């Protein structure tokens, strides 16, 4: 037939268990299936527990982004308990969480993605690899890549020291609970935090953001693939006031060239192609049910298929920088000129096609890292040693709440229903669920499955661009399936 099917299981240098299956014709991807192959069932594990237990249990969905689930959880708990988080505790939450944005983005580019473009030393785990691995950097630039990977191992560890200062430990913080944060920042620890922050600030400014633009300039073809639907979701994150109004990332949807506001009732989860009971399809999260069906004909994945008003959307740094359209970093303004001969001030000046591209998503992630440095500076101005950060609310007998935030990889919400003072339902809708999901009941592909269309596979023996595309979305399958 001229169609050749390639399967990759595991997709490595992601988090979690992913199988990718593509079909290649005339040297280009023409059809795709993504399979999240591992299930735990947190949504049923949690039922019947003290609702306060959730802000610990849910972090164990993902050890790379546990602070996103913590944050989502305690916001749902806050609403359900009627807890009025103290201002100083809102900011302390922001500092715990923002710091893992830095760890997560640095982890992803250097330690997950960079080997797509940089050859490591000649020892495991850096060899063996594809004989034709398509690595274009010069001996000089490749040695830059390698030294920065090794430096980034220190930088990300320091980020987790920042998270831990007010979070207790990382992975899996103890410091965020219903009602705020469990430990008031002292003058001393704010000093230890800012000391670490500066080292990360300078590595981000001087090494990380340049190296992304530099490596992209050697891979300009990679701005021309990976567009998929050019549709994106942002649900808001990092409250800046205590009224629920201003957020560092503000909500919004983009589809068919159209900006629109974000309406959470238009979220539904389809399971036709997912291993869950057929009778649970099309449910909004407040009515969601998780009934595993691992033998269901036609299904190929433990990831449900979420759609927004029936749209298949993508989430993550690209999506947020597009919706919010901030100003580009200064280093990004310069290097887009010297290396791409491009002039741009804000994020959307890159244009739709380049931003919604394989290498565009890496660029968004680097820019957002810089942007987050400013937020963390601001909150370090704002926090005030000694002011209380938590209230101690009682568990309601009956109540519900929803917490919306943005995880490093994209949009996240937790929904909790309380009955008889116990969890009655807990539903999770996570970032890599929006990105790595299979087809919905209407046969529409997930975001990554679609972005895979048109990826070049000139050499079936070295189909390196298939996983290159996937890695650009920074997938974690623990979060997608939970």
């Amino acid at each position: 037939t001229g169609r050749t099917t390639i399967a990759i299981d595991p997709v490595t240098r992601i988090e979690g268990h992913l199988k990718a299956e593509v079909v290649v014709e005339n040297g280009k991807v023409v059809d795709a299936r993504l399979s999240g192959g591992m299930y735990r069932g947190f949504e049923t594990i949690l039922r019947g527990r003290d609702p306060r237990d959730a802000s610990q249990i849910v972090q164990r969905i993902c050890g790379v982004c546990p602070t996103a689930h913590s944050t989502a959880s305690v916001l749902a708990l806050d609403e359900a308990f009627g807890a009025k988080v103290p201002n100083n505790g809102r900011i302390t939450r922001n500092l715990i969480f923002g710091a893992n944005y830095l760890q997560s983005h640095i982890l992803h580019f250097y330690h997950l993605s960079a080997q797509d473009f940089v050859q490591g030393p000649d020892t495991a785990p850096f060899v063996p690899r594809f004989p034709k691995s398509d690595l274009r950097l010069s001996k000089e630039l490749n040695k830059a890549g390698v030294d920065q990977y090794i430096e980034a191992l220190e930088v990300r560890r320091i980020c987790h020291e920042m998270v831990a200062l007010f979070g207790g430990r990382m992975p899996h913080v103890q410091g965020q609970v219903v009602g705020g944060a469990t430990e008031i920042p002292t003058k001393e620890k704010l000093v230890e935090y800012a000391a670490r922050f500066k080292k990360v600030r300078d590595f981000v400014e001087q090494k990380y953001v340049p190296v992304v633009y530099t490596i992209g300039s050697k891979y300009k073809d990679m701005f021309k693939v990976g567009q998929g639907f050019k549709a994106a979701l942002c649900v808001g994150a990092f409250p800046l006031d205590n009224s629920g109004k201003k957020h560092l990332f503000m909500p919004g949807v983009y589809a068919k060239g159209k900006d629109m506001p974000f309406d959470p009732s238009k979220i539904k989860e389809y399971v036709k192609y997912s291993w869950f009971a057929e009778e649970t399809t099309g449910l909004n999260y407040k009515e969601g049910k998780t009934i595993p069906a691992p033998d269901k004909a036609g299904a190929y994945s433990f990831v449900k298929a979420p759609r927004y008003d029936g749209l298949s959307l993508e989430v993550g740094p690209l999506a947020r920088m597009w919706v919010n359209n901030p100003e580009l970093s200064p280093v990004g303004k310069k290097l887009l000129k010297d290396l791409f001969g491009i002039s741009a001030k804000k994020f959307r000046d890159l244009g739709e096609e380049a931003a919604f591209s394989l290498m565009g998503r890496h660029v968004a992630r680097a820019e957002e890292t810089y942007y987050m440095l400013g937020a963390i500076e601001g909150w370090l101005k704002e926090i005030k040693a000694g002011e209380d950060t938590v209230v101690m609310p009682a568990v309601p007998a009956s109540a519900e709440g929803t917490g919306f935030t943005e995880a490093p990889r994209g949009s996240l919400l937790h929904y909790v229903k309380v009955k008889d003072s116990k969890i009655d339902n807990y539903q999770i809708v996570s970032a890599s669920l929006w990105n790595c999901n299979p087809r919905d009941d209407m046969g529409q592909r997930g975001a990554v499955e679609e972005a895979l269309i048109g990826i070049p596979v000139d050499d079936i023996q070295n189909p390196v661009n298939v996983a290159r595309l996937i890695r650009a979305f920074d997938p974690x399958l623990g979060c997608a399936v939970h």
């Binding site: 399967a7 990759i8 299981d9 595991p10 997709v11 490595t12 268990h17 199988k19 591992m38 299930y39 735990r40 069932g41 947190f42 049923t44 594990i45 019947g48 003290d50 237990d53 610990q56 249990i57 164990r60 993902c62 050890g63 790379v64 546990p66 982890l107 330690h111 997950l112 490591g120 020892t123 495991a124 785990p125 850096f126 063996p128 594809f130 560890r157 987790h160 020291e161 998270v163 831990a164 200062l165 207790g168 430990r169 990382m170 992975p171 103890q174 410091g175 609970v177 469990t182 430990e183 008031i184 620890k189 230890e192 595993p292 691992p294 433990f302 209380d388 950060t389 938590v390 101690m392």
Partner: protein, 279 residues
């Protein structure tokens, strides 16, 4: 000496036990990877992928039969004939964690079950689960595999517990050879399979707030650090770990100081340690 080959397989894990390892301070992770071990298979960080990565692990495993170390992160689900954790595909056939542990477990020198999931089942085996999440040792015994297993628990473990267990065992093997040292490793395990250097001491017996516990002085908000956290739910009393001394993330904090201990190292975690925020 030589860096032994290591394969790291993830079952029902959250990747937290790989991340915590990346936070190792002395030695850093890079020294671990270049000077201590040869990490030949790890899906989160390795260069190659897919069927080729599995075939690379199998060639090393054949080459080094009986000499390689297998790290297992996450629990092993046995229901639905293992379909709740498929970890790979080779030769047009899916590979479950059940399959993989039966393939590689009998030929490893030893198995290190890292994290409470792998060691004891943990959250995937908890009330409400449906997948048959089984602890590594139970799974191996259940299918008659006799390879020694070491439990390094925690959710996540401290990096020092992982690195520390590995260095102790590799020095024991250097000292005594391979059979000899692994006997010395087994000798330092408690009744729960855990190394006593790290899990030999009780948290409560050594808590700096033990004075306040005894005085009956109890904090009533989390942000009050003067009192003991008992009333807030601290599970130090039933938990054997050394976080009170080495603390976490380069020593900048720990769970009792910031909040409470939730007992993440213990075989009954989480259900037997819940509710977390009442005694």
């Amino acid at each position: 000496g030589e860096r032994p080959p290591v394969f790291w397989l993830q079952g029902q894990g959250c990747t937290g036990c790989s991340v915590t390892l990346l936070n190792s301070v002395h030695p850093s992770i890079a020294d671990v990877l270049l000077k201590v071990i040869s990490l030949e298979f790890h899906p989160t960080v390795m260069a190659w992928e897919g069927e080729h990565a599995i075939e690379h692990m199998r060639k090393v495993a054949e080459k080094f039969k009986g000499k390689f170390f297998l790290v297992i992160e996450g629990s092993v689900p046995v229901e639905a004939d293992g379909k709740y954790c498929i970890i790979g595909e080779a030769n047009h056939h899916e590979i479950s964690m059940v399959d993989a542990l039966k393939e590689f477990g009998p030929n490893a020198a030893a198995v290190l079950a890292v994290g409470t999931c792998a060691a004891y089942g943990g959250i995937p085996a908890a009330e409400g689960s449906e997948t048959g999440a089984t602890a590594v040792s139970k799974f191996l015994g259940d299918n008659g595999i006799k390879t020694p297993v070491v439990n390094i628990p925690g959710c996540p473990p401290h990096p020092d517990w992982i690195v520390g267990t590995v260095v102790l065992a590799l020095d024991a093997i250097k000292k005594n050879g391979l059979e000899g040292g692994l006997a010395e490793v087994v000798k330092v395990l408690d009744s729960d399979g855990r190394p006593t250097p790290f899990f030999g001491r009780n948290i409560h017996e050594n808590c700096p707030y033990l004075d306040k516990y005894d005085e009956g002085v109890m904090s009533a908000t989390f942000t009050d650090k003067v009192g003991c956290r008992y009333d807030l739910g601290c599970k130090g009393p039933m938990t054997m770990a050394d976080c009170f001394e080495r603390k976490w993330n380069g020593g900048v904090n720990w769970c009792v100081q910031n909040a409470v201990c939730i007992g993440c190292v213990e075989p009954d975690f989480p259900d037997g340690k819940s509710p977390f925020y009442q005694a």
